[PDB]
C-alpha cells in the first residue's frame, strides 16, 4: 500500500488498447441495471391496476350514498345480488372514505381536486374465467372495468425485461473471458516485469497484485460510464416516453433515486465479477 503510482505505468503503456474494455463491460453491467430498472418500475406500476381476474361495479352510486355497509334498504339487495351468481368467489365493498385516499396514495400525480365524491363505491369482485368480460359486465347492468381489454403492461414490459437479461447474458460470458485473456496478454506484453520479480523472489500476491488493482479501477470506471449511460439514455433519448404515460395515469413514473439505490449493488457485481475472473486466470500465471 506504500506504493500507489505504479499501476499507471500500464495505462501510460496502453491508453489506446486498455480503453477497449471500459466501454465493452459498460453494456454488460448497464443492461443489468436497465433490467432491474424496468422490473422496479413494473412492480410500482402494478399497484394502480387490478389483478388477473377482476370486475368493477360503478353502475349505481346513489344507493351507496355515504353509508359504509351496503345494508340500507336497496343497498342490501344490491350487495346481496353480487354473490347470487355462481361465477364469483368473494364479495367486497368500499365506503365513501375510500374514494380520495386511494386516489391520492396510488396516484401521486394529483392528491386534491377530488372531494371524495368523484370516485363511487367499488363493489369489486373476482371471477374464474377471464374470457366473457362484457357478458359479466352486462350481467348486472340494470361498471368502469378494464380487466384484460388491453394487454400491454402485463406483456411487453416483462418481455423487454426478459429480452434485456438475455442480451446481457449472451455477451456477459464474452466480457468475463475478455477480462481473462486481456490481462493474460497484458502480462504477456511485459515478460521482463514478471521475470525480474521471480528472480528477486517477490511474493506471489504482490506479483499479480497490480494487475488486479488496475482491473478493479478500470472496471469501476466501466460501471461508472454505464451508470452515466443509463442516466443519459433516459434524459437525452425517450424524453416523451415516460412523462406522457405518467400524465395519462397509466404507467407509474421513475425518478433518479433508484439508480442510486441499485448503484452499490451494481459496483459490487462488477468488482466481484472482475476479481473472480482475474484471479482465475492469474492462478495460472
Amino acid at each position: 500500500g506504500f506504493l500507489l503510482n505504479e499501476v499507471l505505468t500500464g495505462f501510460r503503456r496502453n491508453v489506446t488498447m486498455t480503453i477497449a474494455m471500459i466501454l465493452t463491460t459498460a453494456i454488460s453491467v448497464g443492461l443489468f441495471g436497465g433490467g432491474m430498472l424496468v422490473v422496479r418500475l413494473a412492480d410500482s406500476s402494478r399497484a394502480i391496476y387490478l389483478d388477473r381476474v377482476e370486475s368493477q361495479v360503478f353502475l349505481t352510486e346513489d344507493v351507496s350514498a355515504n353509508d359504509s355497509s351496503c345494508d340500507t334498504t336497496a343497498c342490501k339487495a344490491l350487495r346481496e345480488k353480487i354473490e347470487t351468481r355462481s361465477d364469483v368467489k368473494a364479495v367486497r365493498f368500499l365506503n365513501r372514505q375510500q374514494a380520495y385516499d386511494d386516489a391520492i396514495r396510488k396516484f401521486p400525480q394529483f392528491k386534491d381536486v377530488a372531494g371524495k365524491d368523484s370516485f363511487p363505491a367499488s363493489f369489486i369482485v373476482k371471477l374464474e374465467n377471464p374470457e366473457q368480460h362484457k357478458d359479466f359486465d352486462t350481467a348486472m347492468k340494470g361498471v368502469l372495468n378494464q380487466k384484460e381489454l388491453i394487454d400491454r403492461l402485463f406483456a411487453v414490459l416483462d418481455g423487454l425485461s426478459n429480452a434485456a437479461f438475455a442480451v446481457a447474458l449472451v455477451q456477459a460470458i464474452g466480457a468475463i473471458l475478455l477480462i481473462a485473456n486481456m490481462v493474460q496478454v497484458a502480462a504477456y506484453t511485459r515478460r521482463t516485469e514478471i521475470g525480474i520479480m521471480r528472480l528477486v523472489g517477490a511474493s506471489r500476491w504482490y506479483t499479480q497484485l497490480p494487475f488486479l488493482v488496475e482491473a478493479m479501477l478500470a472496471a469501476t470506471m466501466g460501471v461508472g460510464i454505464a451508470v452515466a449511460g443509463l442516466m443519459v439514455v433516459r434524459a437525452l433519448f425517450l424524453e416523451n416516453a415516460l412523462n406522457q404515460f405518467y400524465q395519462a395515469n397509466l404507467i407509474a413514473k421513475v425518478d433518479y433515486a433508484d439508480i442510486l439505490f441499485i448503484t452499490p449493488w451494481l459496483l459490487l457485481l462488477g468488482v466481484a465479477m472482475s476479481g473472480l475472473t482475474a484471479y482465475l486466470t492469474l492462478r495460472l500465471y
Binding site: E193, G201, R204
Partner: protein, 197 residues
C-alpha cells in the same frame, strides 16, 4: 537428489552431488551450454541457507530473495531509468523509504560507472549494458550469486572488465558462479572448476 527433465537421456542430471556454499569464486565448466544452465537453475524453481530444493512450498520466495541471479542477455526495461532499474529490486522485498535511498552510490561505485543516474537504459553502451544488471544483482548483501553466463555477448575487453568486476565484488565474501563459454579466458585466474558429464 535426482530429477528427469524429459523422457530421454539427460546428460546434466547425472545425480552428481557436489556442494561448497562457502567458496570465494567457483564456477561451472559447461560442455553443452544448455545443460550447464540447468545446474544454475537447480538452485531456484527446478523441481544456501536451506538444503537445496528439498521441502519447498510457499516459503520459496523467502529464500529466492537471498541468492539472486543475472541472465546472459538483457534483463532490462526501457520505460524506467538506470536509477529506477538499479533501485527497482529494493521496494519489492520490503524496505523503508529512507532505507532504499539510505546509500545510493555504493552499488554504482563497485561497477566503475558512477553518476549520471538519469539515462534511459537504451542510451547505455553495449559493453556496459549488462553492468546495470550486475549492479542490480548485488543491491543488498547476498549469500550466493548464480551468474548464468554473465559474460554473454560482449567484447573481449569488456568481458575482461566484467570478469574483473565480478572477481572484485565478491571480496565481501559472496560466491559468484560463472558459466563457461570459452577456454582461454575463464581458465586464466586460477580458480576452481567442476568435473561432470
Amino acid at each position: 537428489v535426482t530429477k528427469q527433465y524429459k523422457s530421454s537421456a539427460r546428460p546434466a542430471l547425472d545425480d552428481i552431488n557436489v556442494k561448497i556454499d562457502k567458496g570465494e569464486f567457483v564456477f561451472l565448466i559447461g560442455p553443452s551450454g544448455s545443460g550447464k544452465s540447468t545446474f544454475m537453475r537447480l538452485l531456484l524453481a527446478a523441481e544456501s541457507k536451506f538444503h537445496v530444493n528439498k521441502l519447498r512450498g510457499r516459503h520459496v520466495p523467502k529464500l529466492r530473495q537471498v541468492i539472486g541471479c543475472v541472465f546472459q542477455d538483457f534483463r532490462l526495461l526501457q520505460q524506467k531509468t538506470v536509477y529506477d532499474n538499479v533501485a527497482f529490486a529494493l521496494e519489492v522485498i520490503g524496505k523503508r523509504t529512507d532505507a532504499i535511498n539510505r546509500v545510493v552510490p555504493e552499488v554504482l561505485e563497485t561497477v566503475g560507472l558512477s553518476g549520471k543516474a538519469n539515462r534511459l537504459p537504451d542510451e547505455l553502451s553495449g559493453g556496459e549494458q549488462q553492468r546495470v544488471a550486475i549492479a542490480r544483482a548485488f543491491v543488498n548483501r547476498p549469500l550466493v550469486l548464480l551468474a548464468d553466463e554473465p559474460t554473454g555477448n560482449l567484447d573481449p575487453e569488456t568481458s575482461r572488465d566484467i570478469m574483473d568486476l565480478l572477481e572484485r565484488i565478491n571480496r565481501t565474501g559472496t560466491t559468484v558462479l560463472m558459466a563457461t563459454h570459452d577456454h582461454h579466458i575463464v581458465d586464466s585466474m586460477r580458480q576452481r572448476v567442476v568435473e561432470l558429464s
